Design a binder for these strands. Structure first.
Ligand SMILES: Nc1ncnc2c1ncn2[C@H]1C[C@H](O)[C@@H](COP(=O)(O)OP(=O)(O)OP(=O)(O)O)O1
Ligand SMILES: [Mg+2]
Ligand SMILES: [Mg+2]
Lengths: 412, 545
DNA sequence: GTCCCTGTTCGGGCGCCG
RNA sequence: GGUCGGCGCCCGAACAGGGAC
């Protein structure tokens, strides 16, 4: 009975043609069981090699889950469906969510399997289950219903979701609810008890309205801010002042009012790195003015809703990770630092994966967008291991950098 | 006859037309063979005589099957391939014997005339048109279209493989614990039934394949080991590679060398310690596949070594999922690594090598990390899991590397194996300046136009040097300045520079470079007791920068 | 505009399997 | 002399990004 929303990719673009990567045995077993059940329910069905399109598939467990969960990497399809889900059927992002004291994340992806997918669009949602030791050719399916992981599905389900939440919203009109991909972000200023209670209620409401759910409680207020800090010393060596001046000189690209003239004077000769040199009165003055500038916010820095977000991460060592989110160079919308995450002091990849999820989750709440990451890692290293640590049902875009720290800018 | 399996709707790229190419003129023997063939298939259902209302044509030929008398009729469908829709391949890789589990009974079937048993899309048949001369000059010749997958047409492999899956599925579903390794038309079928029940199950499956137009000739390896399979020999408790025959040459063409390197590569899956760096090194500045190239002394040595490796005999074993995988890596030198994957000691599942070189500058730690990555992925494909590693690097070495590196890096569960040469870092940069050690402010720059430059330093003690350089670059002069301070300092030294470039190369503690200069720097760094490097910005009058 | 790092992405050659 | 699909290894050339004069 249900009418399918026609969908067309952006003009001048083909469907995705991405190769499936190797899967561990436990991930293939889980996927085989899942797809079998899904075909039995009509949610997906077998297709052949004459459909030329493909999207990688794998599987994850969410934080503390024990329950395997199918994940399709629709990044290519998403950035080819872009004016469909961002423009024609965009979901509005509430500025208030980020201001809420507590924000809980609920998984509602399952819902979307209620709704048929436009027949003409199904071919674009094709994936291939692989097999241990290539015992078999891959087994290809495509979607008949709205797939988890495609930005189109929350778009199309939007109607049903608003219709479903209408009552609860009416009762609790102080509560912000935001739908992003397979997630629902539920924020309020209640004290915790009544917050979690209300989440439970909503879980019930959703339960009766024909939609299930597989803690996940954010506090945007306590999302730390990591600024630039200068050292404080009673005695300064030639080396300290060289460090101080390179740092200030890096800083100046972000804060224009910063100056190093008086400080540079102190480094005029070619003295021994280890030599102590008294700060000149002028230099002290310059330095104090600089601490003052770094205390203040950057000037004229505003979010542009038309531009993408970029996140850079620096590995600081000792389990410490710093990051910045910007749309334009040196115009940081946000800075921060994580410490003591899962994998601290033993596994850089697991830590970085965690960082990437935390940062993405923060961006979803603050701007309704997921940033493109600049990752401090060789590609092969990342690609080999990141799916072992992934605990989220979306995947951000990313690229690779190798930027030796010559100046210690975001950590002291 | 021909399979009743439903046909695969195939199309052509929009705005494109069928092929129009005239026959390769061919040998009379070929012509005879093809005439036989086309008559046969005409009788069977596979080929059809076309009228004059077929505008298209594409050349054919034939090859011999290996160790055989039968001909394989092929069609040079290149042009038609250009103009056919793209497919998504379902063949994702190649089965490997080290991935097989132990089965009580085993059979290996092969499908008779595989492709020609699968119906082509009726509507697409028109484009598969080919002509055959009765005699090379004497008669026009009868011409036809295919009713079944051609051999040479880019859609045939995936369509066959998918159709084979489709056919196998009801039987497999009925028989959960029958393992079937399906690669193109080879069916390795394995079970844990006693030979009788197994033979029954085999017969069932051959009947089933028959009901779908597929014949299993009596080139079926009855449960009589060894089974010849995917290039290997499968014995009940071990497998080996089929005989590998190295090229032997007085004078070596680049074609010969490519062939030799390919053959050694195949060999390295189960023969331990094969290297190819020196032989591969001769294929850098090569143009012609005919161009002859002299064997270097070193390449000569490498070949001798491999040749005697290939003498002492080897076999791999099969996989027992109730035991851990272990991967052991040894360093060979010149960025070459080998490895063996086993479960019990001395009993390799398989072996392999890693020699790839990435980036201008590198070190052994990075390369070991890459060899780990490669082995991990291979293991996931073959067994679906990551093996425990035994590696020739001290736990302390690795800790120092990964904790101080600015890039994220990791190795999964591993233990130190004391098998020399051990991987080590060859030098270490101080984190703090060194008291009592001479400080060098160094500096280099060149002329973009005239390519002339200068490299030198000035010292907190008055030591000074400037050196003129001919045919150089900014980057070069920058490594040169550092290098001169290393050359002219005592065992401990602080060095100040504005080259981010040079600093970024050196702080990655390389032990290996494409660049001689960088290698000379490395030699100098290794001889020092204590080196502290620091960066300062230019154009601000810091010392003599 | 050169020089010189990350990454794509297409082409070639050999080997091995069908 | 000549066809296809896969996987391995190697060579190459473009293109994108990013730094430094
Ligand atoms: N050199 C090739 N070019 C194109 N296709 C090939 C080639 N070699 C093999 N194939 C394809 C076509 C075959 O139908 C299919 C099966 O391989 P194969 O067993 O070697 O031949 P075959 O099944 O057609 O006859 P046979 O009964 O002798 O095995 O693989
Ligand atoms: Mg056959
Ligand atoms: Mg065969």
């Amino acid at each position: 009975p249900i009418e399918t929303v026609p969908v067309k990719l952006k003009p001048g673009m083909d469907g995705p043609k991405v190769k499936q990567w190797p899967l561990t045995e436990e991930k293939i077993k889980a996927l085989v069981e899942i797809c079998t059940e899904m075909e039995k329910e009509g949610k997906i069905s077998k297709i052949g090699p004459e459909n030329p399109y493909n999207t990688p598939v794998f599987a994850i467990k969410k934080k503390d889950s024990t329950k395997w969960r199918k994940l399709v990497d629709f990044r290519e399809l998403n950035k080819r469906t872009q004016d469909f889900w961002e423009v024609q059927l965009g979901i509005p992002h509430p500025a208030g969510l980020k201001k809420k004291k507590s924000v809980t994340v609920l998984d509602v992806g399952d819902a979307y399997f209620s709704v048929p997918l436009d027949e003409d669009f199904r071919k674009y949602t094709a994936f291939t289950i692989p097999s241990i030791n290539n015992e078999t050719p891959g087994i290809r399916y495509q979607y008949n219903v709205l797939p988890q992981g495609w930005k189109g599905s929350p778009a199309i389900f939007q109607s049903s979701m608003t219709k479903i939440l209408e009552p609860f919203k009416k009762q609790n009109p102080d509560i912000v609810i935001y739908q992003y991909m397979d997630d629902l972000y539920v924020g309020s200023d209640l004290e915790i008890g009544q917050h979690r209670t209300k989440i439970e209620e909503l879980r019930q409401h959703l339960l009766r309205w024909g939609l299930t759910t597989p803690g996940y409680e954010l506090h945007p207020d306590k999302w730390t801010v990591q600024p630039i800090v200068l050292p404080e010393k009673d005695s300064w060596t030639v080396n300290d002042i060289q460090k101080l001046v390179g740092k200030l000189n890096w800083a100046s690209q972000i804060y224009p009012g910063i100056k190093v003239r008086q400080l540079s004077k102190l480094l005029r000769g070619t003295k021994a790195l280890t030599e102590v040199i008294p700060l000149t009165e002028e230099a002290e003055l310059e330095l104090a003015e600089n601490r003052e500038i770094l205390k203040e916010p950057v000037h004229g820095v505003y979010y542009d809703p038309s531009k993408d977000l970029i996140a850079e991460i620096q590995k600081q060592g000792q389990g410490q990770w710093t990051y910045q989110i910007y749309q334009e160079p040196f115009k940081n919308l946000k800075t921060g630092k994580y410490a003591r995450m899962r994998g601290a002091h033993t596994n850089d990849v697991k830590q970085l994966t965690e960082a990437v999820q935390k940062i993405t989750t923060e961006s979803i709440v603050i701007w309704g967008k997921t940033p493109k990451f600049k990752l401090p890692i060789q590609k092969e290293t990342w690609e080999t291991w990141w799916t072992e640590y992934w605990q989220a049902t979306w995947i951000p875009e990313w690229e690779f950098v190798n930027t030796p720290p010559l100046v210690k800018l975001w950590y002291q | 006859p021909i399979s009743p399996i439903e046909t695969v709707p195939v199309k052509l790229k929009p705005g494109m037309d069928g092929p129009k190419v005239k026959q390769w003129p061919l040998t009379e023997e070929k012509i005879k063979a093809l005439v036989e063939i086309c008559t046969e298939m005409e009788k069977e259902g596979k080929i059809s005589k076309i009228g004059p209302e077929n505008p298209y044509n594409t050349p054919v030929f034939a090859i011999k099957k290996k160790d055989s008398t039968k001909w394989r009729k092929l069609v040079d469908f290149r042009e038609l391939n250009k103009r056919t829709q793209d497919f998504w391949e379902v063949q994702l890789g190649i089965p490997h014997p080290a991935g097989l589990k132990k089965k009580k009974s085993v059979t290996v079937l092969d499908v008779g005339d595989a492709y020609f048993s699968v119906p082509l899309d009726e509507d697409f048949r028109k484009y598969t048109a080919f002509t055959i001369p009765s005699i090379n000059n004497e008669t026009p010749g009868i011409r036809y279209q295919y009713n079944v997958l051609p051999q040479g047409w880019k859609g045939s492999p995936a369509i066959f493989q998918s159709s084979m899956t489709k056919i196998l599925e009801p039987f497999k579903k009925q028989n959960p614990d029958i393992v079937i390794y399906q690669y193109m038309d080879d069916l390795y079928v394995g079970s844990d039934l006693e030979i009788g029940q197994h033979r029954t199950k085999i017969e069932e499956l051959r009947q089933h394949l028959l009901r779908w137009g597929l014949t299993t000739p009596d080139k079926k390896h009855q449960k009589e080991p060894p089974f010849l399979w995917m290039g290997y020999e499968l014995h009940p408790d071990k497998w080996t590679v089929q005989p590998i025959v190295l090229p032997e040459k007085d004078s070596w063409t680049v074609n010969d060398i490519c062939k030799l390197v390919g053959k050694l590569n195949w060999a390295s899956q189960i023969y331990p310690g094969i290297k190819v760096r020196q032989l591969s090194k001769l294929l850098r500045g090569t143009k012609a596949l005919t161009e002859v190239i002299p064997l270097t002394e070193e390449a000569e040595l490498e070949l001798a070594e491999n040749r005697e490796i290939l003498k002492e005999p080897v076999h791999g074993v099969y996989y027992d999922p109730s035991k851990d995988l272990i991967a052991e890596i040894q360093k060979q030198g010149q960025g070459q690594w080998t490895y063996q994957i086993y479960q019990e000691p001395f009993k390799n599942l398989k072996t392999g090598k890693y020699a790839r070189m990435r980036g201008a500058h590198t070190n052994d730690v990075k390369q070991l990390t890459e060899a780990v990555q490669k082995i991990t992925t291979e293991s996931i494909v073959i067994w679906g899991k990551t093996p425990k590693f035994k590696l020739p690097i001290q736990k302390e070495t690795w800790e120092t590397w990964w904790t101080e590196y600015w890039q994220a890096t990791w190795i999964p569960e591993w233990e130190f194996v004391n098998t020399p040469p051990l991987v080590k870092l060859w030098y270490q940069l101080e984190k703090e300046p060194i008291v009592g050690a001479e400080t060098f402010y160094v500096d280099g720059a060149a002329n973009r136009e005239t390519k002339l430059g200068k490299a030198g330093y000035v010292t907190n003690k008055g030591r000074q040097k400037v050196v003129p350089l001919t045919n150089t670059t900014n980057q070069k002069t920058e490594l040169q300045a550092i290098y001169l301070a290393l050359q002219d300092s005592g065992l401990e030294v602080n060095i100040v520079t504005n080259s981010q470039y040079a600093l970024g190369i050196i702080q990655a503690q390389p032990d290996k470079s494409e660049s001689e200069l960088v290698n000379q720097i490395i030699e100098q760094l290794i001889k020092k007791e204590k080196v502290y490097l620091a960066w300062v910005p230019a154009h601000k009058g810091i010392g003599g920068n």
